[PDB]
Amino acid sequence: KHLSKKLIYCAFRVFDVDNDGEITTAELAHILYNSITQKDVNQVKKMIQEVDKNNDGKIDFYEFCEMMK
């Protein structure tokens, strides 16, 4: 389990582009779609809402783990 934990940490760090400890809509859209559309942004917003435990519109590491485990 430790190794999957370590890789979950690394994955978050790489998605958290600006290193503030939160994945935003803009960061998540960028990872999901490497010049993308409003429709895509709204779909990302809805995804975040399914796992956003503190309702701030972002995904922190705890929320990322909860979603992964």
Add this chain to the structure above:
Amino acid sequence: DRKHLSKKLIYCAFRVFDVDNDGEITTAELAHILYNITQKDVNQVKKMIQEVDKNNDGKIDFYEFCEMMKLKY
């Protein structure tokens, strides 16, 4: 639907770890992601890969990466 999203993020995570896009994470790629290596570090990585290598080739493919992310039923 939240299963679907975790699945999408597991795909994206793999892709980013698989630096050269050949569909396999190798010792060198995993070491690179784990360490911002000495021989000791390389061997530590090789041991981690062993724990989850299912086809005994010393690399982690997406299927193995996914399996590792979930419980053994």
